[PDB]
Amino acid sequence: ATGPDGVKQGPGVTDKTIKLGIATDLTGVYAPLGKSITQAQQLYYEEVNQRGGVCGRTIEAVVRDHGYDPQKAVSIYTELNNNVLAIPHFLGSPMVSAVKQRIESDKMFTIPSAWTTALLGSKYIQVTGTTYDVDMINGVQWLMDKKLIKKGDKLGHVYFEGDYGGSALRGTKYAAEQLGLEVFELPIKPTDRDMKSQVAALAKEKVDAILLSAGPQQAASLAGIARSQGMKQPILGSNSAYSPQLLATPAKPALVEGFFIATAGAPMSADLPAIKKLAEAYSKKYPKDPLDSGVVNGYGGASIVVSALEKACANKDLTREGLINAHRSEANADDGLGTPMNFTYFDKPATRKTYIIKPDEKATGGAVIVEQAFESELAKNYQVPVGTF
Numbered sequence: 001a002t003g004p005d006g007v008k009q010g011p012g013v014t015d016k017t018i019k020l021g022i023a024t025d026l027t028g029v030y031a032p033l034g035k036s037i038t039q040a041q042q043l044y045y046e047e048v049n050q051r052g053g054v055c056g057r058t059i060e061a062v063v064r065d066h067g068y069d070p071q072k073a074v075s076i077y078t079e080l081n082n083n084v085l086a087i088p089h090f091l092g093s094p095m096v097s098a099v100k101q102r103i104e105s106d107k108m109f110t111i112p113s114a115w116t117t118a119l120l121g122s123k124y125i126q127v128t129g130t131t132y133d134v135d136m137i138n139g140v141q142w143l144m145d146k147k148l149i150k151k152g153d154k155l156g157h158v159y160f161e162g163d164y165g166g167s168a169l170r171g172t173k174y175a176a177e178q179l180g181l182e183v184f185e186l187p188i189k190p191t192d193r194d195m196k197s198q199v200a201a202l203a204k205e206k207v208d209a210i211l212l213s214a215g216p217q218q219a220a221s222l223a224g225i226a227r228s229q230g231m232k233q234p235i236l237g238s239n240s241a242y243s244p245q246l247l248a249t250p251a252k253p254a255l256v257e258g259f260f261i262a263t264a265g266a267p268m269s270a271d272l273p274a275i276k277k278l279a280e281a282y283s284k285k286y287p288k289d290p291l292d293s294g295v296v297n298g299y300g301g302a303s304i305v306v307s308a309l310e311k312a313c314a315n316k317d318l319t320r321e322g323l324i325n326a327h328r329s330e331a332n333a334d335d336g337l338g339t340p341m342n343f344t345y346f347d348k349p350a351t352r353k354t355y356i357i358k359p360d361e362k363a364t365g366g367a368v369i370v371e372q373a374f375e376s377e378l379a380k381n382y383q384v385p386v387g388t389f
């Protein structure tokens with residue numbers, strides 16, 4: 001329990017090692033993005049280890065694949081929880097929801113790649129960036145500002161049922177109420193591979209804009225089918241409704257025009273020194289794995305946990321209490337990757353600024369900024385739910 005350097009050691013911490021857990025999707029709908037996130041975290045931890053680790057201890061990240069399935073995530077959580085100090089990458093809103101009570105009981109610092117409001121309200125869970133609702137509020141306001149929609153128009157929102165799509169949808173509906181828009185709602189599951197019935201329904205409803213809270217496979221299908229039907233409505237996706245791999249498929253033309261993504265994260269093409277450095281470092285380590293916005297997300301999550309570990313080390317306290325208090329002492333985080341945040345609270349989003357990006361085969365990371373990160377008044381005044389959607 002206390003190392004020979006006088007540092008208190010919690011679960012997963014020995015005299016020479018700090019074990020961290022990663023619960024991701026390597027095989028399901030988010031496979032290429034979970035790979036990128038996971039590899040970017042490993043890149044960060046390797047760089048740290050090369051510089052002597054933390055508190056003289058090497059960081060070891062153990063990786064489990066839940067396949068974007070909540071029951072498997074639970075099983076994985078119970079296999080890791082007594083033997084890792086923290087979980088700096090846990091992919092997926094329903095997956096982390098399923099273990100929220102255990103996280104709280106265990107005092108497990110968890111950094112999801114998941115942005116539901118259902119994960120707010122826990123000291124131990126850092127929801128990074130914006131929440132999904134705030135991204136759709138910003139995004140709908142942007143559609144109106146850009147005259148892609150007007151008062152009285154109808155939005156069709158295709159969404160993964162539950163925490164992720166439902167949170168996004170909450171934002172859509174708030175914006176629609178405030179702005180005088182109608183909403184047509186289309187729930188889907190991650191196992192729905194083919195969007196042609198959804199496209200048919202969107203067309204029947206004569207929507208003016210199409211919103212999507214799903215993964216890359218659904219985005220390719222929906223965009224491709226819509227454009228093959230002559231639909232000209234803009235498409236606005238949540239932050240994970242795209243991977244650059246899709247540009248190497250016939251969906252490309254339906255993604256590089258008329259398709260936008262609302263996200264708190266900067267793409268790999270942003271003109272920031274830390275982004276350029278990351279692009280070079282990641283490309284060097286993993287030459288065969290395309291750069292994507294998951295790389296940014298994973299490197300950033302690793303940066304968050306390491307910052308907290310270093311502060312906890314300096315307090316001679318690599319326990320779960322020491323770690324969370326180190327993390328929650330940071331009111332002004334800015335890792336240089338394009339998403340400044342405040343970590344001292346957890347009853348509201350860490351930021352309310354959303355970028356609009358689009359797919360671009362010419363750009364580093366397969367995407368470019370269309371609108372620099374902004375917080376609409378609409379989003380600023382919105383009441384964000386805490387621990388539910």
Ligand SMILES: CCCCCCCCCCCCCCCC(=O)O
Pocket residue numbers: 030033034091092093094113114115116128129130164239240263264265266293294297339
């Ligand atoms: C700064 C934070 C926003 C960064 C967004 C980068 C997108 C990376 C890909 C994420 C894949 C995971 C999707 C999870 C969907 C869900 O919430 O269940």
